[PDB]
Write an enzyme that holds these catalytic residues in place. Structure first.
Site, PDB file in Angstrom:
ATOM      1  N   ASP A  50      14.004  82.873 -15.100  1.00  0.00           N
ATOM      2  CA  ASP A  50      14.407  81.480 -15.023  1.00  0.00           C
ATOM      3  C   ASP A  50      13.621  80.766 -13.924  1.00  0.00           C
ATOM      4  N   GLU A  52      14.005  78.238 -10.509  1.00  0.00           N
ATOM      5  CA  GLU A  52      14.863  77.667  -9.478  1.00  0.00           C
ATOM      6  C   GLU A  52      14.007  76.968  -8.435  1.00  0.00           C
ATOM      7  N   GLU A 145      39.925  96.894   0.994  1.00  0.00           N
ATOM      8  CA  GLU A 145      40.664  96.473  -0.211  1.00  0.00           C
ATOM      9  C   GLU A 145      40.208  97.302  -1.422  1.00  0.00           C
ATOM     10  N   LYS A 149      42.314  99.832  -4.016  1.00  0.00           N
ATOM     11  CA  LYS A 149      42.295  99.663  -5.465  1.00  0.00           C
ATOM     12  C   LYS A 149      41.986 100.974  -6.180  1.00  0.00           C
TER      13      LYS A 149
HETATM   14  N1  LIG Z   1      21.716  74.978  -1.556  1.00  0.00           N
HETATM   15  C1  LIG Z   1      22.119  75.417  -0.230  1.00  0.00           C
HETATM   16  C2  LIG Z   1      23.475  75.794  -0.248  1.00  0.00           C
HETATM   17  O1  LIG Z   1      23.810  76.483  -1.594  1.00  0.00           O
HETATM   18  C3  LIG Z   1      25.228  76.875  -1.703  1.00  0.00           C
HETATM   19  O2  LIG Z   1      25.473  77.408  -2.992  1.00  0.00           O
HETATM   20  C4  LIG Z   1      25.018  78.661  -3.137  1.00  0.00           C
HETATM   21  C5  LIG Z   1      25.784  79.360  -4.276  1.00  0.00           C
HETATM   22  O3  LIG Z   1      27.218  78.988  -4.246  1.00  0.00           O
HETATM   23  C6  LIG Z   1      25.191  78.862  -5.366  1.00  0.00           C
HETATM   24  O4  LIG Z   1      25.400  79.656  -6.470  1.00  0.00           O
HETATM   25  C7  LIG Z   1      25.192  78.894  -7.661  1.00  0.00           C
HETATM   26  C8  LIG Z   1      26.560  78.617  -8.305  1.00  0.00           C
HETATM   27  O5  LIG Z   1      27.352  77.847  -7.431  1.00  0.00           O
HETATM   28  C9  LIG Z   1      26.424  77.864  -9.633  1.00  0.00           C
HETATM   29  N2  LIG Z   1      27.749  77.686 -10.220  1.00  0.00           N
HETATM   30  C10 LIG Z   1      25.534  78.635 -10.611  1.00  0.00           C
HETATM   31  C11 LIG Z   1      24.158  78.926  -9.994  1.00  0.00           C
HETATM   32  N3  LIG Z   1      23.382  79.755 -10.923  1.00  0.00           N
HETATM   33  C12 LIG Z   1      24.245  79.628  -8.632  1.00  0.00           C
HETATM   34  O6  LIG Z   1      22.911  79.660  -8.112  1.00  0.00           O
HETATM   35  C13 LIG Z   1      22.674  80.812  -7.303  1.00  0.00           C
HETATM   36  O7  LIG Z   1      23.118  82.049  -7.991  1.00  0.00           O
HETATM   37  C14 LIG Z   1      22.191  82.578  -9.097  1.00  0.00           C
HETATM   38  C15 LIG Z   1      22.528  83.948  -9.358  1.00  0.00           C
HETATM   39  N4  LIG Z   1      23.917  84.016  -9.882  1.00  0.00           N
HETATM   40  C16 LIG Z   1      20.714  82.474  -8.633  1.00  0.00           C
HETATM   41  O8  LIG Z   1      19.865  82.703  -9.753  1.00  0.00           O
HETATM   42  C17 LIG Z   1      20.398  81.137  -8.058  1.00  0.00           C
HETATM   43  O9  LIG Z   1      18.993  81.119  -7.593  1.00  0.00           O
HETATM   44  C18 LIG Z   1      21.242  80.832  -6.923  1.00  0.00           C
HETATM   45  N5  LIG Z   1      20.847  79.447  -6.378  1.00  0.00           N
HETATM   46  O10 LIG Z   1      23.589  78.807  -4.978  1.00  0.00           O
HETATM   47  C19 LIG Z   1      23.518  78.653  -3.682  1.00  0.00           C
HETATM   48  C20 LIG Z   1      22.701  79.796  -3.049  1.00  0.00           C
HETATM   49  O11 LIG Z   1      21.459  79.916  -3.736  1.00  0.00           O
HETATM   50  C21 LIG Z   1      26.140  75.707  -1.516  1.00  0.00           C
HETATM   51  N6  LIG Z   1      26.086  74.853  -2.787  1.00  0.00           N
HETATM   52  C22 LIG Z   1      25.831  74.838  -0.355  1.00  0.00           C
HETATM   53  O12 LIG Z   1      26.358  75.463   0.869  1.00  0.00           O
HETATM   54  C23 LIG Z   1      24.383  74.537  -0.149  1.00  0.00           C
HETATM   55  O13 LIG Z   1      23.960  73.580  -1.119  1.00  0.00           O
HETATM   56  N1  LIG Z   2      43.360  79.086   0.031  1.00  0.00           N
HETATM   57  C1  LIG Z   2      43.208  78.009  -0.935  1.00  0.00           C
HETATM   58  C2  LIG Z   2      41.838  77.809  -1.186  1.00  0.00           C
HETATM   59  O1  LIG Z   2      41.112  79.163  -1.026  1.00  0.00           O
HETATM   60  C3  LIG Z   2      39.648  79.075  -1.178  1.00  0.00           C
HETATM   61  O2  LIG Z   2      39.066  80.350  -0.959  1.00  0.00           O
HETATM   62  C4  LIG Z   2      39.303  81.223  -1.951  1.00  0.00           C
HETATM   63  C5  LIG Z   2      38.253  82.356  -1.921  1.00  0.00           C
HETATM   64  O3  LIG Z   2      36.952  81.846  -1.431  1.00  0.00           O
HETATM   65  C6  LIG Z   2      38.770  83.224  -1.044  1.00  0.00           C
HETATM   66  O4  LIG Z   2      38.271  84.493  -1.211  1.00  0.00           O
HETATM   67  C7  LIG Z   2      38.440  85.217   0.011  1.00  0.00           C
HETATM   68  C8  LIG Z   2      37.062  85.389   0.668  1.00  0.00           C
HETATM   69  O5  LIG Z   2      36.501  84.127   0.946  1.00  0.00           O
HETATM   70  C9  LIG Z   2      37.151  86.183   1.976  1.00  0.00           C
HETATM   71  N2  LIG Z   2      35.804  86.377   2.507  1.00  0.00           N
HETATM   72  C10 LIG Z   2      37.809  87.547   1.748  1.00  0.00           C
HETATM   73  C11 LIG Z   2      39.188  87.388   1.084  1.00  0.00           C
HETATM   74  N3  LIG Z   2      39.751  88.715   0.821  1.00  0.00           N
HETATM   75  C12 LIG Z   2      39.133  86.578  -0.217  1.00  0.00           C
HETATM   76  O6  LIG Z   2      40.493  86.407  -0.639  1.00  0.00           O
HETATM   77  C13 LIG Z   2      40.641  86.307  -2.058  1.00  0.00           C
HETATM   78  O7  LIG Z   2      39.888  87.377  -2.757  1.00  0.00           O
HETATM   79  C14 LIG Z   2      40.537  88.769  -2.684  1.00  0.00           C
HETATM   80  C15 LIG Z   2      39.866  89.674  -3.574  1.00  0.00           C
HETATM   81  N4  LIG Z   2      38.417  89.688  -3.245  1.00  0.00           N
HETATM   82  C16 LIG Z   2      42.025  88.618  -3.081  1.00  0.00           C
HETATM   83  O8  LIG Z   2      42.671  89.870  -2.905  1.00  0.00           O
HETATM   84  C17 LIG Z   2      42.700  87.608  -2.222  1.00  0.00           C
HETATM   85  O9  LIG Z   2      44.140  87.545  -2.572  1.00  0.00           O
HETATM   86  C18 LIG Z   2      42.095  86.296  -2.377  1.00  0.00           C
HETATM   87  N5  LIG Z   2      42.804  85.314  -1.425  1.00  0.00           N
HETATM   88  O10 LIG Z   2      40.387  83.214  -1.352  1.00  0.00           O
HETATM   89  C19 LIG Z   2      40.681  81.997  -1.712  1.00  0.00           C
HETATM   90  C20 LIG Z   2      41.531  82.007  -2.999  1.00  0.00           C
HETATM   91  O11 LIG Z   2      42.736  82.723  -2.750  1.00  0.00           O
HETATM   92  C21 LIG Z   2      39.074  78.123  -0.186  1.00  0.00           C
HETATM   93  N6  LIG Z   2      39.172  78.762   1.204  1.00  0.00           N
HETATM   94  C22 LIG Z   2      39.739  76.800  -0.140  1.00  0.00           C
HETATM   95  O12 LIG Z   2      39.297  76.000  -1.293  1.00  0.00           O
HETATM   96  C23 LIG Z   2      41.233  76.835  -0.135  1.00  0.00           C
HETATM   97  O13 LIG Z   2      41.691  77.212   1.164  1.00  0.00           O
HETATM   98  N1  LIG Z   3      23.798  86.329  -6.881  1.00  0.00           N
HETATM   99  C1  LIG Z   3      22.747  85.569  -6.195  1.00  0.00           C
HETATM  100  N2  LIG Z   3      23.207  84.467  -5.626  1.00  0.00           N
HETATM  101  C2  LIG Z   3      22.363  83.648  -4.948  1.00  0.00           C
HETATM  102  N3  LIG Z   3      21.046  83.955  -4.851  1.00  0.00           N
HETATM  103  C3  LIG Z   3      20.575  85.078  -5.432  1.00  0.00           C
HETATM  104  C4  LIG Z   3      21.407  85.886  -6.098  1.00  0.00           C
HETATM  105  N4  LIG Z   3      20.700  86.927  -6.575  1.00  0.00           N
HETATM  106  C5  LIG Z   3      19.425  86.771  -6.204  1.00  0.00           C
HETATM  107  N5  LIG Z   3      19.353  85.636  -5.504  1.00  0.00           N
HETATM  108  C6  LIG Z   3      18.379  84.853  -4.815  1.00  0.00           C
HETATM  109  O1  LIG Z   3      18.032  83.818  -5.536  1.00  0.00           O
HETATM  110  C7  LIG Z   3      16.653  84.124  -6.067  1.00  0.00           C
HETATM  111  C8  LIG Z   3      16.624  84.048  -7.447  1.00  0.00           C
HETATM  112  O2  LIG Z   3      17.764  84.672  -7.986  1.00  0.00           O
HETATM  113  P1  LIG Z   3      17.752  85.136  -9.581  1.00  0.00           P
HETATM  114  O3  LIG Z   3      17.239  84.010 -10.452  1.00  0.00           O
HETATM  115  O4  LIG Z   3      19.167  85.491  -9.969  1.00  0.00           O
HETATM  116  C9  LIG Z   3      16.681  86.658  -9.787  1.00  0.00           C
HETATM  117  P2  LIG Z   3      14.877  86.333  -9.415  1.00  0.00           P
HETATM  118  O5  LIG Z   3      14.533  86.781  -8.014  1.00  0.00           O
HETATM  119  O6  LIG Z   3      14.548  84.871  -9.581  1.00  0.00           O
HETATM  120  O7  LIG Z   3      13.998  87.186 -10.525  1.00  0.00           O
HETATM  121  P3  LIG Z   3      14.205  86.947 -12.151  1.00  0.00           P
HETATM  122  O8  LIG Z   3      15.000  85.679 -12.370  1.00  0.00           O
HETATM  123  O9  LIG Z   3      12.856  86.818 -12.812  1.00  0.00           O
HETATM  124  O10 LIG Z   3      14.953  88.118 -12.742  1.00  0.00           O
HETATM  125  C10 LIG Z   3      16.371  85.641  -5.646  1.00  0.00           C
HETATM  126  O11 LIG Z   3      14.898  85.871  -5.448  1.00  0.00           O
HETATM  127  C11 LIG Z   3      16.998  85.757  -4.587  1.00  0.00           C
HETATM  128  O12 LIG Z   3      16.197  85.213  -3.472  1.00  0.00           O
HETATM  129 MG   LIG Z   4      15.117  83.596 -11.172  1.00  0.00          MG
HETATM  130 MG   LIG Z   5      18.430  82.341 -11.366  1.00  0.00          MG
HETATM  131 MG   LIG Z   6      44.081  91.207  -1.976  1.00  0.00          MG
END
Ligand SMILES: NC[C@@H]1O[C@H](O[C@H]2[C@@H](O)[C@H](O[C@@H]3[C@@H](O)[C@H](N)C[C@H](N)[C@H]3O[C@H]3O[C@H](CN)[C@@H](O)[C@H](O)[C@H]3N)O[C@@H]2CO)[C@H](N)[C@@H](O)[C@@H]1O
Ligand SMILES: NC[C@@H]1O[C@H](O[C@H]2[C@@H](O)[C@H](O[C@@H]3[C@@H](O)[C@H](N)C[C@H](N)[C@H]3O[C@H]3O[C@H](CN)[C@@H](O)[C@H](O)[C@H]3N)O[C@@H]2CO)[C@H](N)[C@@H](O)[C@@H]1O
Ligand SMILES: Nc1ncnc2c1ncn2[C@@H]1O[C@H](COP(=O)(O)CP(=O)(O)OP(=O)(O)O)[C@@H](O)[C@H]1O
Ligand SMILES: [Mg+2]
Ligand SMILES: [Mg+2]
Ligand SMILES: [Mg+2]
Ligand SMILES: Nc1ncnc2c1ncn2[C@@H]1O[C@H](COP(=O)(O)CP(=O)(O)OP(=O)(O)O)[C@@H](O)[C@H]1O
Ligand SMILES: [Mg+2]
EC number: 2.7.7.-
Lengths: 253, 252
Positions: A50, A52, A145, A149
């Site tokens: 893909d 990005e 945790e 499990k």
């Molecule tokens: N951009 C900088 C920061 O990114 C954060 O979000 C991070 C993370 O939640 C977010 O994850 C997003 C999701 O949410 C959205 N719903 C689907 C999307 N494919 C996924 O994207 C991410 O995960 C994919 C792998 N599954 C990767 O292929 C992709 O490169 C990566 N950007 O990508 C960011 C990290 O790459 C926050 N948005 C914000 O704190 C700030 O904008």
């Molecule tokens: N609490 C209400 C809302 O929760 C959100 O965060 C959600 C989510 O990120 C967060 O996930 C948190 C993580 O982050 C943190 N780093 C470790 C922690 N164990 C995990 O907790 C969650 O995931 C666990 C399983 N792995 C579950 O067992 C647990 O019950 C659940 N609260 O739990 C929340 C949902 O329960 C935001 N904080 C905010 O939008 C608002 O406060």
């Molecule tokens: N679950 C994830 N969440 C956020 N960023 C991720 C991620 N997994 C990998 N990455 C970061 O985001 C970049 C792109 O992620 P992806 O698109 O999921 C795999 P890629 O490195 O681009 O190779 P590919 O898409 O050809 O398989 C990675 O190079 C890495 O830097």
């Molecule tokens: Mg990619």
């Molecule tokens: Mg990607």
């Molecule tokens: Mg729990």
């Protein structure tokens, strides 16, 4: 749509520059920098990879993304203000080794003032305490945790969850190793392969990953034994490196 | 030594001790305290953890305390009423896995029906939000997964295929949960409950059998099962009107 189609690096870069032109036309002088990350930014993209891209905006509270498909390919473009991006690049979460390789990936295509270089410098200069805190949190929040499990699975089931749980534990261990060695994994496919090439692994991790990487996750008894051994290796590993959390109080607040 | 075996009565001794500590420290800023998770449903197992939720009057309140004593582990979330209600109504891709919390609540303290108000918000979410979440899930996750396993087919590595297959089966379970507007009981029951739902995408049940049995070593059969599931998604989305916009090369 037929799903992702085969594409060449040349075709993906043609899309990147078309998107760059549209970004510059729409947002104009609010665009500070545009870069490609992921596999395309390193120029190691495969046939079905893909696209990005990231964009640094001058506008404050700018934090949005466009992620879409044409049916044949998929694109994700992130737009962040400089302050939001620099703050995100210096925060170390449990999935830092999985998310923050982006900031060691950037292929600049447009930059009006070294903004992408500043992002790279910030991400690579995070002080060591943030990794120490993230590791200790990972042990409590995820690994402890997970142990409950799989120990519940042993005594009351269901074993149908054990393969998925084992994959999640192996991934969590890869985050633990990535935070300790401060390495960001290249791609999702390389997480486990790169985690097991690191030195000073917790005991039992490589053996556990062998089950996950080979796909032989049907022997529930050997998985539970491998998980306990990994859990034992974690407690020895954490104490040896000083990732010690005070657990003496019933209520720590 | 990791988590130890504890009884439900012992976990309720800890819950009420934490309640007293919360009330002593935060006083009148505490609007409500509840237990969720398996302890809230009173189906906790020998090694289950404890998770509690607190509604605060303080504006912008959003913090958590998560700790272990070495023998057991507790997580307590503190949110203002507005932050909690907004989160309870927001539908992400993992909604079927996260928002069962709001159908789990065992009230321990409530000064004004706040826990009931959270429950009403979570169960009254607009249907369009589930439609949007499904379309986003297909583009953001499933389409990305399809590219990853098709890359595996042509260039490897097959060592990622078992982990990727688990992620696809989980994503398909989220898709089904979003369609039926159902929250899964626990993470361990996600796949078993997903395949008991009516109107599954073609190929999903066959793919899940590999994940639930742990037989993920046959890379050729997994790739074939993934393609069939991916094919069944397109028939499924069309059948239910979860239509994805593919008309724009650049949608901005
Ligand atoms: N951009 C900088 C920061 O990114 C954060 O979000 C991070 C993370 O939640 C977010 O994850 C997003 C999701 O949410 C959205 N719903 C689907 C999307 N494919 C996924 O994207 C991410 O995960 C994919 C792998 N599954 C990767 O292929 C992709 O490169 C990566 N950007 O990508 C960011 C990290 O790459 C926050 N948005 C914000 O704190 C700030 O904008
Ligand atoms: N609490 C209400 C809302 O929760 C959100 O965060 C959600 C989510 O990120 C967060 O996930 C948190 C993580 O982050 C943190 N780093 C470790 C922690 N164990 C995990 O907790 C969650 O995931 C666990 C399983 N792995 C579950 O067992 C647990 O019950 C659940 N609260 O739990 C929340 C949902 O329960 C935001 N904080 C905010 O939008 C608002 O406060
Ligand atoms: N679950 C994830 N969440 C956020 N960023 C991720 C991620 N997994 C990998 N990455 C970061 O985001 C970049 C792109 O992620 P992806 O698109 O999921 C795999 P890629 O490195 O681009 O190779 P590919 O898409 O050809 O398989 C990675 O190079 C890495 O830097
Ligand atoms: Mg990619
Ligand atoms: Mg990607
Ligand atoms: Mg729990
Ligand atoms: N990734 C996640 N993020 C947020 N909430 C989650 C979540 N996974 C599960 N949950 C929610 O938080 C509750 C507690 O989650 P977990 O403690 O992880 C399993 P449980 O349902 O409490 O049974 P168990 O602890 O005896 O195994 C779940 O019932 C579910 O409502
Ligand atoms: Mg629990």
């Amino acid at each position: 749509m037929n799903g992702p189609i085969i594409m060449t690096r040349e075709e993906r870069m043609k899309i990147v520059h078309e998107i760059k032109e549209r970004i510059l036309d729409k947002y104009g002088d609010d665009v500070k920098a545009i870069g490609v990350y992921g596999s395309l930014g390193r120029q190691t993209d495969g046939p079905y990879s893909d696209i990005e891209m990231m964009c640094v905006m001058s506008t404050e509270e700018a934090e949005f993304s466009h992620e879409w498909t044409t049916g044949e390919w998929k694109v994700e473009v992130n737009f962040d203000s400089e302050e939001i991006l620099l703050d995100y690049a210096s925060q170390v979460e449990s999935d830092w080794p999985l998310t923050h390789g982006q900031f060691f990936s950037i292929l600049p295509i447009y930059d009006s003032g070294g903004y992408l270089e500043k992002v790279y410098q910030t991400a690579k200069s995070v002080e060591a305490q943030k990794f120490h805190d993230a590791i200790c949190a990972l042990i409590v929040e995820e690994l402890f945790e997970y142990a409950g499990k799989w120990r519940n699975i042993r005594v009351q089931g269901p074993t149908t969850f054990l393969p998925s749980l084992t994959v999640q534990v192996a991934m969590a261990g890869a985050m633990l190793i990535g935070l300790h060695h401060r390495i960001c994994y290249t791609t999702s496919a390389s997480v486990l392969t790169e985690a097991v090439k690191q030195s000073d692994l917790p005991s039992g991790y490589d053996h556990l990953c062998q089950f996950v990487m080979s796909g032989q996750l049907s022997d529930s008894e050997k998985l539970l034994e491998s998980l306990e051994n990994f859990w034992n290796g974690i407690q020895e590993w954490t104490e040896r490196h000083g990732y010690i959390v005070d657990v003496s109080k019933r209520i720590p607040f």
